[PDB]
């Protein structure tokens, strides 16, 4: 079974509405808020915050520069969810397919962000994407603590 899944939910200090705003409509702000991790988010096709938009990421993992091109496969405004499909990039040297879902819970008094990965490894030997999940969690923490009082 080359297929895998990972799920991590974290509680956040900041407004879930703003977190989803960023992930849906203003993804480029992550370069500002997590500049060690994300160097560029560049829209290639479509419009920010729409299904089918195509986005290019310049990012760094363990000090090494990587790129990905993703398509926004799905949006659910009611559940504050967005689904990214990796279509090109460094990850495709390890994974045949890779999808990342970000979903924000803005009830009740606590807000949280859940990251879900669905992937298929090219080979049985390929590592599970723990390092990427740590990355996504770090980005989350960088957003929630950006320019705090």
Which residues of this protein are in contact with Cl ion, per CB under 5 A? 28, 31, 40-41, 50-51
Q: Minimal distance in Å, beta carbon 49 to Cl ion?
A: 7
Closer residue to Cl ion in complex, CB, 31/67: 31
How many other β-carbons are positioned within 10 Å of the β-carbon of residue 46?
14
Closer residue to Cl ion in complex, CB, 28/146: 28
Q: Minimal distance in Å, beta carbon 41 to Cl ion?
A: 5
**Structure tokens, 74:** 């799905």
Q: Minimal distance in Å, beta carbon 91 to Cl ion?
A: 19
Q: How far is it, in rounded angstroms, from Cα 8 to Cα 46?
A: 29
Q: Minimal distance in Å, beta carbon 42 to Cl ion?
A: 6
Closer residue to Cl ion in complex, CB, 22/111: 22
Closer residue to Cl ion in complex, CB, 71/129: 71
Burial class (CB in 10 A: 0-12, 13-18, 19+), 22: buried
Q: In angstroms, what CA-CA distances link 129 with 27, 29, 126?
A: 22, 24, 9
């Amino acid at each position: 079974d080359l297929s895998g899944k990972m799920v991590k939910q974290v509680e956040i200090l900041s407004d879930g509405i703003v977190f989803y705003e960023i992930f849906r409509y203003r993804l480029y702000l992550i370069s500002e808020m997590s500049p060690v991790n994300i160097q560029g988010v560049d829209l290639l096709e479509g419009n920010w915050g729409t299904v089918g938009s195509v986005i290019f990421f310049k990012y760094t993992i363990d000090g090494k520069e990587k790129t990905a091109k993703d398509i926004v496969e799905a949006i659910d405004e009611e559940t504050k969810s967005v689904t990214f499909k990796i279509v090109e990039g460094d990850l495709m040297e390890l994974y045949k397919t890779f999808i990342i879902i970000v979903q924000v819970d803005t009830k009740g008094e606590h807000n949280s962000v859940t990251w879900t990965f669905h992937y298929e490894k090219l080979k049985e030997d390929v590592e599970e994407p723990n390092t990427l999940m740590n990355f996504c969690i770090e980005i989350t923490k960088d957003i929630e603590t950006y320019h705090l009082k």
